[PDB]
Amino acid sequence: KIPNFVVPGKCASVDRNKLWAEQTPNRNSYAGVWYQFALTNNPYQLIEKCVRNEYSFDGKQFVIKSTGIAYDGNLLKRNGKLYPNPFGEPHLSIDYENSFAAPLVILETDYSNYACLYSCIDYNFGYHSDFSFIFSRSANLADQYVKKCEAAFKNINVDTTRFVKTVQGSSCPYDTQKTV
Amino acid sequence: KIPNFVVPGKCASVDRNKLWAEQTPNRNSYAGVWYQFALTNNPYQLIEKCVRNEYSFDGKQFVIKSTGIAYDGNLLKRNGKLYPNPFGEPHLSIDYENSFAAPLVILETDYSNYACLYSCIDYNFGYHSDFSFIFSRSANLADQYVKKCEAAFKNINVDTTRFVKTVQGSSCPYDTQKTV
């Protein structure tokens, strides 16, 4: 009787201090292309299949070009930005044109194979909503790496049975997508 | 479709460019104290009663100190900011500590009595959610000004029967609230 991404209780502690300090020297290694391997039910994401996110780092933020196939079957490009939280909180803000901005934590990454991403918001009625993602440097992602993200999300009490796989691979027009 | 703030169709077009041209030279007149007179159902507002928003303008953004009574009956302060949309869109972003940032349109204001505020977000399933507010320079607001916001919201097809009045006036400890 309520959506599965509206969950009782408060957002979990995920130790952002530690993660922030690991990640600030490594921003250039996080740039380039990342493919969405899987995500939990998200009513905001407008790209359904072939989700490809290209990041450029200018020294203070990332510029993002997100592309793929929209829910109506058309090619779509979205312009985004990733920048430090404006209040000086140890996490990033992910912001998209014609949308809202939300906190984004890099729960775990090795830069060259995978990244595990997390967003959460507390409501005023004793629930939270959270949104989790698994990113890969390739269309595919080996089980050894999926399992690293599974452990990280279990560690903060996210039910990993909520993940759904995203369409990627040879059926995707990536070369067209990268041209906008 | 189930909560009353989940509504069919796309977010309204609200003629943001005309509003931005009117409002941008008058930022200084929008500063000072605004009381929340009424709002449509909002799951993000942590302050239930006696909502008092103090705005300071620095030429580039506003800094906000919001105070009042929380849903558990205790006093609460929240820190906020209002700044131009980072992509250069003709609207502001309203950003709060430990929360997200959303678009914020001023649909109508006279600076000295009232303001009518609007935020909207689109879902990938073809619905939207919007969040509306009536602000006053005083704890009460005269009917003529209430009626002006009702017409501005009807003009963009927001259902104004969704507004609920906020507790204000003599039962509010405003002088305590401003000690922060």
Three-state DSSP at B36 gives: strand
Which residues on adjacent β-strands are paired with residue B132?
Answer: B118
B43, B81, B123 ranked by CB distance to A44: nearest: B123
Exposure letters B105-131 (e unless 16+ CB within 10 A, then b): bbbbbeeeebbbbbbbbbbeeebbbbb
Subunit contact B100:A95, Cβ cutoff 8 A:
no
CA pair distance B172, A55, nearest whole angstrom: 49
Q: Is residue B26 classed exposed, middle or buried when 0-12, 13-18 and 19+ CB atoms within 10 A define those classes?
A: exposed
| Declared resolution, Å | 1.4
Cα maximum dimension of chain A: 46
Which residues on adjacent β-strands are paired with residue B55?
Answer: B32, B64
CA pair distance A94, A85, nearest whole angstrom: 9
Return all residues near A73 (Cβ < 8 A) that are at least 6 apart: none
CA pair distance B68, B180, nearest whole angstrom: 10
With vertex at residue B66, the alpha carbon angle to CA B11 and CA B88, rounded to the nearest 5 degrees, is 40
Say yes or no: domain B1-180 is CATH 3.30.70.20: no
With vertex at residue A136, the alpha carbon angle to CA A101 and CA A164, rounded to the nearest 5 degrees, is 70
For B90-159, the three-class secondary structure string (H helix, E strand, C coil) is CCEEEEECCCCEEEEEEEEECCCCEEEEEEEEECCCCEEEEEEEEEECCCCCCHHHHHHHHHHHHCCCCC
Subunit contact A123:B79, Cβ cutoff 8 A:
no
Subunit contact A125:B43, Cβ cutoff 8 A:
yes
Sign of CA dihedral A137, A141, A145, A147: positive
Subunit contact B89:A98, Cβ cutoff 8 A:
yes
DSSP per residue, A114-152: EEEEEEEEE-TTSEEEEEEEEEESSSS--HHHHHHHHHH
CA pair distance B5, B22, nearest whole angstrom: 29
Residue at A30: amino acid letter: Y
CA pair distance B129, B8, nearest whole angstrom: 9
Subunit contact A101:B97, Cβ cutoff 8 A:
no
CA pair distance B180, B176, nearest whole angstrom: 7
B43, B93, B97 ranked by CB distance to A87: nearest: B97
CA pair distance B158, A163, nearest whole angstrom: 35
Report yes or no: A158 and A132 within 8 Å, Cβ to Cβ.
Answer: yes
B95, B103, B125 ranked by CB distance to A86: nearest: B95
Three-state DSSP at A177 gives: helix
Place of tokens 């509010």: B172
Q: Which tokens go with A90?
A: 């140890």
Residue at B10: amino acid letter: K
Q: For residue B103, list chain A residues with Cβ-Cβ distance below 8 A.
A: 100
Residue among A124, A127, A128 with most chain B CBs within 10 A, to mutate: A124
Question: Nearest Cα to A173, choosing from A56, A47, A81?
Answer: A47
Report yes or no: B66 and B44 within 8 Å, Cβ to Cβ.
Answer: no
B43, B103, B125 ranked by CB distance to A123: nearest: B43
Three-state DSSP at A162 gives: helix
Task: Give the domain ranges of chain B.
Answer: 1-180
Tally the residues of chain A. Answer: 180
Find the helix or strand (DSSP H, E) in which B173 lies: none
Residue at B81: amino acid letter: K
